[PDB]
């Protein structure tokens, strides 16, 4: 942000060689404070009065206290600080005169002071005891009760020791001081008049120049970021919607640091946060049953689906069950069912959370069943005493949607093998993404290879050799029989993620089972709140799909961490036929890029299978073939555009020959676009397929000699029968 704006460079240096003089006087930092407070300094010409482009009606004279002393004859002013929001200091000069009597330039300082001052220290942080005490040079510390410079009409009150009892009242008064003090410590002439009379304020402004001005210039600089920022919620305020288990997140904290890589998590339903701490294993790939959030079974994958969220959805539950059964059928010995045993604590949790109510008890074939109550209207539940198994059945006055009606049975849930013991299943840690620092991936490549690559003559081969390495050892993801689809490092990270939450106190196996949702190309989901854990250990939870986007762009993408996004993002995920949205740079630069051969041919192919009418039909109409022949011609110019030999020419040439090759294509498009009846769909395309060429050539143009506009330059060409001189022409046309 450039602080000084010199409006009129009207006079010769004299004006300039005066404004400069004026500034270099003022302390470099005072400025960095001003520019920091978003201020800007205006040096205009002879606009003295209300004429400044910024001198009109905003926040003017309401209560007149203006110069050092109090005058207010605005019209007769050459300096003014636009009080309210941003500091906007405006000044000007007439003939050669600040020198001789500095009693004039001394206002460009107080006239300034009002600027920083009030947020300089006087009242910067607050009245800081430093300035609150320094403001006590009234007549206590030093035998110097000589402050008839700033304390005349406001402080002849030597009969009222100043401190938290009064100083607030007339802050502004104590500003005029910080001003005439500043003006004096800096005025070109009187520097000691301050040092002579006030013996402290000197040692004050002085400390300010020591670094005091670098002070606020840094408590503000930092404030610069964190002020206007990305509204998240670092700290235990998010780790609460993070669903993660604190000992775990805090556990993960060690990794993000050691390896330096962002770790992003989706939401782990609260209901199983503790089910985790409690040692309950987590659902992986093998299971696809639905979780649930109501009643005793809550947070488990009830073998019975009508006992999970989708309570009522006949087909959802009908297929829901259909999925656990197979979950076991195909992956037996590893996946199956075991009775629900709500342990101690868990019971007290599904209470304050309000999931279940523990009341009346009862006696059945000799066992104590508390009876767990839930407002459901078809299932009643009871939990044994011997063991805490849980049970339900259809109320004598209701039925199961699938058309089932049963008596007191234990609630079975899904569970997987872990050290040979079917453990109940609950929500796992589904990573949304993994951002290792670009430098870590480096430590992923085997020296001999990255070595055998850079020791290359071909600079352009070198880049490749590198990129492939970077691609291979870092962007590439293979599909795995166990962990879904993921990267090798992604995997290693996966293991360290677990052995991390294992050397803590987890006895349920792994809590991070598959790869990062960024490969969930099939059934990608869109979560608003996403939990991240910077390489610094701070916890973070975005709020929007955008904020997450915005964040990642600022602290990951934009920074030096390697990241990639769900190949299905702007496209249409097949599985759930969902359309997400994620800002893709390449795309944001399409409006200006001549398409390729294949990108064209491709596009055609698209519509061909969308309507059932191609750019040209398989007939005899010599007007069709005219067309076919003609697109084959577009699929040349475009293909001629992106030529590799283009290097053997100098930059400028490239732009040119390319600009032509473009116009080339464009033209012939204009051509077909004027042909016979080419379906109205291709009609549009070919038109948009122009917009680009157009835009593209504009670029290649305003890149060198930009006076000519695409429209024009085109007219001047002759694409009749002779092409030869056409180019020879075009050349001069751009010279």
């Amino acid at each position: 942000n450039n602080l000084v704006k010199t409006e009129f460079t009207n006079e010769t240096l004299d004006k300039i060689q005066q404004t400069q003089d004026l500034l270099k006087k003022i302390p470099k930092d005072v400025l960095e404070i001003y520019s920091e407070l978003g201020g800007e300094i205006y040096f205009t010409d002879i606009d003295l009065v209300e004429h400044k482009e910024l001198q009109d009606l905003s926040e003017e004279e309401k209560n007149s206290m203006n110069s050092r002393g109090e005058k207010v004859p605005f019209a007769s002013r050459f300096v003014f600080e636009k009080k309210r929001e941003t500091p906007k200091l405006i000044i000007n000069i007439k003939d050669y005169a600040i020198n001789s009597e500095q009693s004039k330039e001394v206002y460009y300082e107080i006239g300034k002071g009002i600027s920083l001052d009030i947020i300089s220290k006087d009242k910067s942080l607050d009245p800081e005891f430093l300035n609150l005490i320094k403001s006590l040079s009234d007549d206590s510390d030093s035998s110097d009760l000589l402050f008839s410079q700033k304390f005349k009409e406001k402080l002849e009150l030597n009969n009222k020791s100043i401190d938290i009892n009064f100083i607030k009242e007339n802050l502004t008064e104590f500003q005029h001081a910080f001003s005439l003090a500043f003006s004096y410590y800096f005025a070109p002439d009187h520097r000691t008049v301050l040092e002579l009379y006030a013996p402290d304020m000197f040692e004050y402004m002085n400390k300010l120049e020591k670094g005091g001005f670098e002070k606020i210039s840094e408590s503000l600089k930092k404030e610069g970021v964190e002020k206007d920022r990305i509204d998240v919620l670092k700290g235990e305020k998010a780790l609460k919607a993070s669903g993660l288990v604190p000992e775990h997140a805090d556990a993960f904290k060690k990794i993000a640091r050691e390896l330096n890589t962002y770790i992003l998590f989706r939401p782990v339903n609260k209901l199983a946060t503790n089910l985790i701490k409690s040692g309950v294993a987590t659902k992986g790939l093998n299971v696809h049953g639905k979780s649930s959030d109501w009643g005793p079974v809550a947070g488990y994958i009830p073998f019975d689906q009508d006992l999970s969220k989708k309570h009522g959805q006949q087909l959802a539950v009908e297929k829901g069950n259909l999925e656990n059964k197979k979950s076991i059928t195909e992956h037996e010995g590893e996946i199956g069912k075991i009775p629900l045993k709500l342990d101690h604590l868990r019971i007290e949790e599904l209470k304050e959370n309000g999931i279940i109510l523990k009341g009346k008890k009862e006696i059945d074939n000799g066992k104590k069943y508390y009876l767990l109550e839930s407002n459901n209207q078809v299932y009643e539940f009871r939990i044994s005493d011997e063991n805490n198994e849980v049970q339900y059945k259809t109320k004598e006055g209701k039925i199961t949607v699938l058309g089932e009606k049963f008596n007191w049975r234990n609630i079975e849930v899904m569970a997987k093998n872990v050290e040979g013991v079917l453990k109940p299943l609950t929500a796992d840690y589904d990573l949304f993404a993994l951002a290792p620092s670009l430098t870590e991936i480096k430590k992923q490549i085997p020296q001999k290879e990255w070595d055998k690559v850079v020791n290359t003559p071909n600079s352009l081969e070198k880049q490749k050799g590198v990129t492939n390495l970077l691609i291979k050892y870092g962007i590439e993801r293979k599909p795995d029989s166990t962990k879904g689809t993921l990267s090798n490092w992604q995997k290693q990270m996966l293991d360290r993620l677990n052995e991390a939450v294992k050397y803590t106190g987890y006895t349920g196996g792994d809590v991070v089972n598959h790869g990062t949702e960024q490969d969930n190309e099939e059934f990608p989901e869109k979560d608003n709140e996403i939990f991240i854990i910077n390489p610094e250990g701070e916890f973070i939870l975005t709020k929007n799909w955008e904020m997450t986007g915005r964040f990642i762009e600022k602290n990951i993408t934009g920074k030096d961490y390697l990241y990639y996004f769900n190949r299905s993002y702007n496209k249409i995920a097949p599985g759930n036929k969902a359309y997400i949205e994620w800002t893709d740079p390449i795309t944001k630069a399409k409006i200006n890029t001549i398409p390729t051969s294949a990108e064209f041919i491709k596009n055609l192919s698209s519509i061909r299978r969308s309507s059932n009418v191609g750019v040209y039909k398989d007939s005899g109409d010599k007007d069709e073939f005219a067309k076919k022949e003609s697109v084959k011609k577009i699929a040349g110019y475009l293909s001629d555009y992106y030529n590799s030999a283009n290097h053997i020419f100098s930059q400028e040439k490239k732009r040119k020959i390319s600009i032509f090759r473009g116009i080339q294509a464009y033209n012939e498009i204009e051509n077909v676009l004027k042909s016979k009846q080419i379906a109205p769909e291709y009609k549009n395309y070919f038109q948009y397929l122009k917009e680009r060429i157009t835009n593209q050539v504009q670029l290649l143009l305003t890149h060198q000699k930009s006076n000519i506009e695409f429209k024009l330059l085109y007219k001047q060409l002759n694409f009749t029968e002779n092409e030869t001189d056409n180019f020879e022409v075009f050349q001069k046309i751009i010279d």
């Binding site: 970077l470 990639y564 740079p585 390449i586 294949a598 992106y642 290097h647 390319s658």
Partner: protein, 146 residues
């Protein structure tokens, strides 16, 4: 097994370059097809291809002899994506364009030391249209084209 989207393309591959009108193409032009579709395959590699999957004498290829020949090279060079992500990686700022600044600014992080003179030598040789910055298309070429 090439998807259908993946087939409609190879269709308007033959289609476009066929001045004879059967659905059969020659050597000289089989090349032309792929090239435009996006490949620089050696005038040597076209020989045994058309020399094995069609010793049918003629020296042509029905769509079949093609639809197949293609679902062969459509495997390892499946780098179309890796590559488009390498690209987004260097494009450190989001402008869809790679600039020598960022080229260097990343060539370095991956432990490579480049001279302000050399990065401006890669970019240059990689830029096809002269703007003085590689775009995805220019990049895609730079990478694949051997």
């Amino acid at each position: 097994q090439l998807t259908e989207e993946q087939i409609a393309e190879f269709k308007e591959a033959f289609s476009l370059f066929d001045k004879d009108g059967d659905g059969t193409i020659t050597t000289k032009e089989l090349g032309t097809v792929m090239r435009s579709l996006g490949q620089n395959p050696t005038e040597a590699e076209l020989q045994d291809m058309i020399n094995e999957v069609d010793a049918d004498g003629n020296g042509t290829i029905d769509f079949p002899e093609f639809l197949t020949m293609m679902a062969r090279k459509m495997k390892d060079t499946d780098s179309e994506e890796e590559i488009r992500e390498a690209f987004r990686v260097f494009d450190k700022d989001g402008n869809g364009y790679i600039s020598a600044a960022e080229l260097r600014h990343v060539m370095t992080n991956l432990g490579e030391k480049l001279t302000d003179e050399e990065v401006d030598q890669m970019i240059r040789e990689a830029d096809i249209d002269g703007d003085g910055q590689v775009n995805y298309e220019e990049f895609v070429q730079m990478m694949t084209a051997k």
